[PDB]
Amino acid sequence: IDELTTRKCSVDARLQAENERAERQDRGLKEAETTYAKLVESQKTLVDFVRKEYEDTKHQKY
């Protein structure tokens, strides 16, 4: 029981920290998902913003 308690204490400590790892991963993607979401909205809008400038630049010269 004590020998398995050492396994029990080890597995409990690592999993209770693994739950911390799991939530640390959750906050890890939270920024990653947000930043990717922040980029894709910014990426698409700024590209067409350039096209908008590009269109008028083409319009003025063509």
Add this chain to the structure above:
Amino acid sequence: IDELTTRKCSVDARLQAENERAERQDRGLKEAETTYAKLVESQKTLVDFVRKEYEDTKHQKY
């Protein structure tokens, strides 16, 4: 953990059953060992009386 704990509890309960079994043997032994001491002392006493009885039988003859 749970499978090994109930193994510990079961053997502890069974050991208590084994504990009294030797206690019954011990308490019975003490009564039996002491009782035979009186019997063998009486056994030697009676054969001593028989030894005296053999002397007594021929003493009346004399």
